[PDB]
Write a protein that binds this ligand. Structure first.
Ligand SMILES: NC(=O)C1=CN([C@@H]2O[C@H](COP(=O)(O)OP(=O)(O)OC[C@H]3O[C@@H](n4cnc5c(N)ncnc54)[C@H](O)[C@@H]3O)[C@@H](O)[C@H]2O)C=CC1
Ligand SMILES: Cc1cc2nc3c(=O)[nH]c(=O)nc-3n(C[C@H](O)[C@H](O)[C@H](O)COP(=O)(O)O)c2cc1C
Ligand code: SF4
Ligand code: SF4
Ligand code: SF4
Ligand code: SF4
Ligand code: SF4
Ligand code: FES
Ligand code: FES
Ligand SMILES: [Ca+2]
Lengths: 439, 139, 225, 120, 156, 226
């Protein structure tokens, strides 16, 4: 499959031997042209408005528009100290797009942070990276050294007077650190408890200073916009969500992989025309569109375009757009138990409903797995779904935790009914006391 | 609706009869869980209300109870007339199978009520006990 | 000058709608068994002719009672120290009818003059040790050291020395030195206080055997025992 | 466990007791006296006991010559067996650690997990 | 008895050069101590607190918060197998059973000779090549239960 | 500022949050992690009410009264069915790991968690699984430590570190194994560490000097003194 630079702005310069692209090869293949144009011929407000009217949305999984997030930075000239953070955590199960993005294209991320830091007037930049991406860390550090030697980073970048210093902050292995306020707290050397918003990090983020946090893929989408223009970016696809997106299917398919597709590409083309469909002897049962924190969908939802509004209207989320396919051999109770065990052991412990209700769901699903389920367990799971939604917990970790549970209860309830075998028993008999026989 | 719900009993025909006889501003209807219509009557209209209830088409013929209450320490007196003490009169009409609780508010210094013995003779001992335990004088 | 103490608290005739203020809660227990070993007959309740409080539960402790002296916070449904929220006008503010206590004096219209007695600088004289006061929250108070639970929290009695003074005396940290004050030789172990200025020796005030009036005094023949 | 629930639930207020603690950390009454000249034998203390320690037994022959001898101390109340509830033990339910029962050894309780453990 | 080495201390100060607050180098200081000594001992918390100028309670809370900072002693090699949803679909349980059979230990435990420490871990970002295992610095994908003891013999 | 609580109009301070404004009016909202001297953090998720956009609104949304300002023209409901159910669910979740310890606990009869368990109306247990446990620490001669009773409301660490300025108390651990205490056994070094016995809404931090000769709150003869 040919990857022209006009329709594959991110992955057209990948090498066929899966090797990283360094500074000379990157600059030979139209590298740092958008950074040069932005830093020389464009004001920071012009770059912010260009990203805004290009329609670039957040690729972290929420779909918030990046230009509006950049526009809510304070207009006071007294706040000269500003921070740009790259959320290179990518700790969601089913998500592997940032690893491919910086393990073999680090200079794209470096250029994107350079452009975003000039646009945001960000004096410092940090790449909050997970500790498990060692090769990505090595490639990013080598690319930072190469860009500093070439004058692309440091003091007096391109002679324009703009000074930008970029660091890589390798994390210590916790899933909640991907939350942007928890990311800021972890960057400050604290426990990664998230923060209540308002105030948003644009007003008071890292060390009280104005801070903008963006995903790896958004910052990789930035230089293509700055180099080729807005009119090219809006004409990539005829959909509401502008630009391309890294989509792909994972789990017992013929080609579990990663491709760059325009928005509006239906999930059946990703599963069959790209991933090759299910493996031999396996039939399709369900799929999660955007990682471990999204609602399950059935075969009837496979003919749906992978946009935010289209997947949102089906009772799920687009998320990271890396779908995971479940075949008929996988029990839904075991899968949801694995998901909830992950979500319960990756809680940050701050707020009560997640911290004290995800283990209850884990224990209920464990009881349903071994057939020790008792009546009222699924009603308890449904109430845990209802009372861990948005606004009930301090952050959005627990709504994403309870989305697969409620989608599996909705679509595959007969597998959950099969675990309830024992009668309900919470009390043991105490001799000499007649119990209250509640009918 | 459960039997313990708070009701004002404005659908009671005695409330409408008292509205048509004494006027809407003459007394205050209190919503309680007693199950009975509680009407706060002004003191100078107490014997008139007693005569009117005794001369109804289905009269209130029995003074079920008559006693007092110290309202000085009562903090939750919302929707109630200002009172330091109060005297309540529980009256039963057997023909209607209904009953009504009249309440007379009293200040701490003017603790005197017109006596109820000309309408119901059990008010003798009831008012003697109310004077004994609360200090309310019955003229 | 002490005429304001009359308005500190209301007198013993103060009542809340005729009743006194309760010292103990309404669910106080054991009344017919607290003294049953001494005598099975219940004694007379202790009368308080001095103040408006009573030695019983037959009193007023309503959160809406018009008073400033609250013996304890309790509300129906609020048994914790969060009942003080019920006892306030607004939560975290003042008491509902004013906090107790009255200032004896107001701010004067005119002030003092400048004190021209500027002292001379501290000169470390040979053979005399200025007693620098050291205070401890557990131990300096006269009555708090008598509390037996404090002796685990009360520090050991040391004496503080400068590194230069300790090197001049040839003493280390932890060794015992003896000093005579008013013809009384007492020995104490030594810590090395780095921030203490030379020519001074540091004594913990209010301790066992160290009176607080020793602060600012001088010491003689402070030597290793 | 000297929790004083029976003393406060007594409508006569004829129970007096004081909490003491052993070196292992279990609670017990330092003393326990009931003024049986005041007690109305209403069983509210037994109803309020969360350990089934205090019990009302089928015994009515309690006549006395002096009223001071109707004050029964802990020596006159503590019997050698379980009484009407032969198997209930509160300290098997409680989370407090005592002798013979460390943390996590009670009913429906898991072993304590250290914060320094390597598991996520 | 703990004492920070000179190289550890200089690396810590170079880390606090990167931030406007010295507290922000606590995670990387703990990681430096962990890389030098395998884990973070009890006195390392007070040493890092003394160097950084922050209380030791915050350093202990950070060390106990993060799963990749080990406050208990581990073996010379740490096996971390993914147990998330995609590797559950790809069958990590056979890999875990093979690991428990070869090492004769449960997850979270250490081999009797101190060579291997078996640990579950969250998604490694390699779901398209699952199941995945992460030994000390190397990630291994496309795992099979037959290749587990062959793979384990190259880590002496 | 004008608020409407359950259809009744109230005049409050717009600079206050909804929880302290509603507690100043005499209304009862359960809460754990908010203190008047410490401020609002939105941790325990117990103070939930239902806020409406306007007067003619029926759906609403669950907000937290400690984290919501009591601005002018606010419309909230405390006795809403969903808010009551969520507050009872929060008490139930806190009660899943709580030890059966009230008779042998020095906070009994003086416990904020007891009052809020009764206030939310939660008296039936349907959780049938195990409860997490914690070892205790020796915190010195004044404070007794019992970490099984913790509800992870972060009042102790907020008071001790932000307010009192102490250094040796902190929060350690993770998802449901959060531990509140010292990094090692030793005496609490703050001169105001004794306020933890009233700051903590549970019996984790208790007056050991009182715990020697312990008696319940209802059995005390109290006086106002200096
Ligand atoms: N590894 C991954 O990529 C993971 C991604 N996610 C995604 O995270 C999403 C939730 O992200 P959150 O940040 O918790 O929620 P969110 O949707 O509220 O925030 C997303 C972005 O929008 C910005 N934003 C929203 N409203 C704003 C306003 N009024 N003013 C200023 N900025 C505003 C935030 O600053 C943030 O950068 C989920 O939809 C999920 O798909 C979740 C888990 C893991
Ligand atoms: C529990 C949780 C975990 C998250 N983890 C990540 C993550 O690992 N990587 C990421 O880019 N965003 C993550 N996010 C989303 C961020 O909050 C935020 O949307 C993102 O870092 C930047 O937004 P953007 O999409 O505009 O770039 C997470 C959100 C939540 C609630
Ligand atoms: S939902 Fe609450 S406890 Fe869970 S990760 Fe978010 S803030 Fe932490
Ligand atoms: S039975 Fe006796 S001791 Fe027990 S509560 Fe009743 S009166 Fe008190
Ligand atoms: S007898 Fe029962 S209720 Fe009374 S103090 Fe002992 S354990 Fe508590
Ligand atoms: S802290 Fe409160 S709820 Fe917990 S055991 Fe003690 S009294 Fe009971
Ligand atoms: S120990 Fe007490 S104050 Fe601290 S978080 Fe736990 S319950 Fe709250
Ligand atoms: S689920 Fe195992 S690598 Fe992602
Ligand atoms: S008091 Fe508001 S969430 Fe805790
Ligand atoms: Ca006196």
């Amino acid at each position: 499959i040919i990857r022209t630079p006009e329709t594959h702005p991110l992955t057209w310069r990948l090498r066929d031997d899966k090797q990283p692209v360094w500074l000379d090869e990157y600059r030979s293949k139209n590298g740092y042209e958008g950074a040069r144009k932005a830093l020389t011929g464009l004001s920071p407000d012009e770059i912010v408005n260009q990203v805004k009217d290009a329609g670039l949305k957040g690729r972290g999984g929420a779909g918030f528009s990046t230009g509006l997030k950049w526009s809510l930075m304070p207009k006071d000239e007294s706040m000269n100290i500003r921070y740009l953070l790259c959320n290179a955590d990518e700790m969601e199960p089913g998500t592997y797009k940032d690893r491919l993005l910086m393990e073999q294209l680090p200079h794209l991320l470096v250029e994107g942070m350079l452009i975003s830091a000039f646009a945001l007037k960000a004096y410092r930049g940090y790449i909050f990276l997970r500790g498990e991406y060692i090769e990505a860390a090595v490639n990013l550090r080598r690319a930072i050294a190469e860009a500093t030697e070439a004058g692309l980073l440091g003091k007096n970048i391109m002679g324009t007077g703009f000074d930008f210093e970029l660091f890589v902050h390798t994390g210590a292995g916790r899933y909640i650190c991907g939350e942007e306020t928890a990311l800021i707290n972890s960057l400050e050397g604290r426990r990664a408890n998230p923060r209540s918003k308002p105030p948003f990090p644009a007003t008071s983020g890292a060390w009280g200073k104005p801070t903008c946090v963006n995903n790896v893929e958004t910052l990789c989408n930035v230089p293509a916009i700055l180099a080729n223009g807005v009119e090219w970016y809006q004409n990539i696809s005829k959909s509401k969500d502008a630009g391309t997106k890294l989509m792909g299917f994972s789990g017992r398919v013929k080609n579990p992989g990663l491709w760059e597709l325009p928005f509006g590409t239906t999930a059946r083309e990703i599963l069959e025309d790209y991933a090759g469909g299910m493996r031999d002897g396996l039939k399709f049962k369900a799929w999660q569109p955007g990682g471990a924190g999204t609602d399950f969908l059935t075969e009837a939802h496979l003919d749906l375009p992978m946009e935010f509004e289209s997947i949102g209207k089906a009772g799920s989320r687009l998320g990271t757009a890396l779908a995971m396919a479940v075949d008929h051999e996988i029990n839904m109770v075991s899968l949801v138990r694995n998901l909830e065990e992950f979500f319960a052991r990756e809680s940050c412990g701050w707020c009560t409903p997640c911290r004290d209700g995800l283990p209850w769901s884990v224990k209920i699903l464990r009881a349903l797995e071994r057939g020790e389920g008792q009546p009222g367990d699924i009603e308890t799971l449904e109430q845990l779904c209802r009372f861990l939604g948005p606004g009930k917990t301090f952050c959005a970790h627990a709504p994403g935790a309870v989305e697969p549970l409620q989608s599996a209860i909705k679509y595959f309830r007969e597998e959950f009914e099969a675990g309830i075998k024992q009668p309900f028993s919470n009390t043991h008999l105490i001799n000499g006391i007649q119990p209250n026989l509640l009918k | 609706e459960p039997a313990w719900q708070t009701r004002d009993h404005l659908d009671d025909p005695v409330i409408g009869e008292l509205r048509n006889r004494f006027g809407p501003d003459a007394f205050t209807v209190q919503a309680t869980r007693t199950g009975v219509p509680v009407v706060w009557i002004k003191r100078e209209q107490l014997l008139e209300v007693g005569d009117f209830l005794k001369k109804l088409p289905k009269p209130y013929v029995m003074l079920f109870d008559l006693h007092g209450m110290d309202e000085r320490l009562r903090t939750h007196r919302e929707g109630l007339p200002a009172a330091d003490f109060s005297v309540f009169y529980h009256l039963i009409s057997i023909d209607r199978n209904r009953d009504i609780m009249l309440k007379v508010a009293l200040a701490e210094n003017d603790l005197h009520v017109p006596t109820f013995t000309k309408l119901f003779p059990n008010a003798n001992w009831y008012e003697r006990e109310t004077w004994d335990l609360f200090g309310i004088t019955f003229d | 000058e002490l005429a304001g103490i009359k308005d500190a608290a209301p007198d013993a005739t103060f009542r809340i709608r005729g009743q006194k203020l309760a010292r103990e809660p309404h669910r106080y227990s054991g009344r017919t068994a607290m003294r049953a070993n001494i005598s099975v007959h219940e004694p007379r309740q202790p009368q308080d002719i001095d103040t408006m409080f009573t030695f019983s539960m037959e009193g007023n402790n309503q959160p809406t009672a018009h008073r400033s002296q609250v013996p304890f916070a309790w509300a129906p449904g609020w048994n914790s120290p969060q009942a003080w929220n019920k006892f306030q006008d607004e939560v975290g503010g003042k008491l509902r009818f004013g906090d107790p206590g009255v200032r004896l004096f107001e701010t004067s219209e005119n002030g003092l003059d400048y004190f021209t007695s500027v002292p001379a600088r501290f000169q470390p004289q040979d053979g005399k040790w200025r007693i620098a006061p050291y205070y401890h929250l557990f131990g300096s108070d006269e009555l708090s050291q008598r509390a037996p639970v404090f002796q685990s929290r009360m520090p050991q009695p040391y004496i503080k020395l400068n590194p230069a003074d300790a090197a001049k005396l040839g003493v280390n940290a932890g060794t015992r030195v003896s000093f005579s004050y008013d013809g009384n030789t007492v020995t104490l172990p030594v810590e090395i206080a780095e921030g203490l200025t030379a020519g001074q020796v540091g004594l913990p005030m209010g301790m066992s055997g160290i009176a607080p009036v020793l602060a600012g005094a001088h010491l003689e023949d402070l030597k290793e025992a | 466990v000297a929790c004083n629930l029976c003393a406060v639930a007594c409508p006569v207020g004829c129970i007096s007791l004081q909490k003491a603690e052993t070196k292992d950390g279990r609670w017990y009454p330092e003393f326990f006296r009931i003024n049986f000249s005041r007690c109305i034998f209403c069983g509210l203390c037994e109803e309020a006991c969360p350990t089934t320690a205090i019990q009302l037994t089928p015994d009515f022959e309690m006549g006395e010559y002096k009223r001071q001898d109707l004050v029964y101390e802990k020596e006159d109340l503590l019997i050698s067996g379980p009484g009407k509830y032969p198997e209930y033990n509160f300290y098997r339910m409680a989370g407090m650690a005592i002798d013979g029962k460390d943390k996590g050894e009670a009913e429906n309780e898991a072993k304590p997990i250290d914060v320094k453990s390597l598991l996520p | 008895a703990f004492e920070l080495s000179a190289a550890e201390r200089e690396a810590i100060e170079h880390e606090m050069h990167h931030y406007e607050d010295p507290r922000a180098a606590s995670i990387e200081a703990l990681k430096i101590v962990q890389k030098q000594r395998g884990w973070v001992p009890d006195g390392a918390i007070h040493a890092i607190a003394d160097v950084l100028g922050i209380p030791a309670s915050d350093v202990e809370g950070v060390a106990t918060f993060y799963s990749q900072i080990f406050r208990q002693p581990v073996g010379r090699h740490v096996i971390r197998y993914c147990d998330s949803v995609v590797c559950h679909i790809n069958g990590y349980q056979g890999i875990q059973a093979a690991l428990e059979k070869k090492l004769n230990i449960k997850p979270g435990q250490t081999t009797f000779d101190g060579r291997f420490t078996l640990l579950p871990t969250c998604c490694l970002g390699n779901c398209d090549k699952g199941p995945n295992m992460m030994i000390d610095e190397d990630t291994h994908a496309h795992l099979t239960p037959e290749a587990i003891p062959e793979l384990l013999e190259r880590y002496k | 500022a004008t608020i409407h609580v359950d259809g009744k109009e109230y005049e409050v301070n717009g600079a206050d949050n909804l929880l302290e404004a509603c507690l100043s009016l005499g209304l009862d909202i359960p809460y754990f992690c908010w203190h008047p001297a410490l401020g609002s953090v939105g941790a325990c998720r117990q103070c939930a009410v239902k806020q409406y956009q306007n007067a003619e609104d029926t759906r609403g949304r669950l907000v937290m009264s400690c984290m919501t300002p009591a601005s002018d023209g606010t419309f909230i409901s405390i006795d809403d069915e969903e808010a009551k159910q969520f507050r009872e669910s929060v008490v139930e979740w806190l009660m899943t790991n709580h030890p059966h310890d009230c008779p042998v606990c020095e906070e009994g009869g003086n416990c904020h968690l007891q009052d809020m368990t009764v206030m939310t109306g939660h008296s039936f247990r349907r959780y049938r699984f195990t409860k997490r446990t914690h070892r205790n620490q020796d915190l010195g001669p004044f404070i007794s430590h019992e970490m099984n009773r913790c509800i992870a409301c972060y009042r102790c660490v907020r008071y001790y570190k932000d307010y009192a300025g102490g250094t040796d108390l902190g929060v350690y651990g993770a998802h449901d194994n959060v531990y509140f205490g010292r990094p090692e056994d030793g005496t609490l070094e703050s001169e105001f560490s004794g306020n933890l016995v009233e700051i903590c809404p549970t019996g984790v931090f208790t007056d050991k000097t009182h715990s020697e000769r312990y008696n319940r709150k209802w059995d005390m003869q109290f006086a106002p003194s200096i």
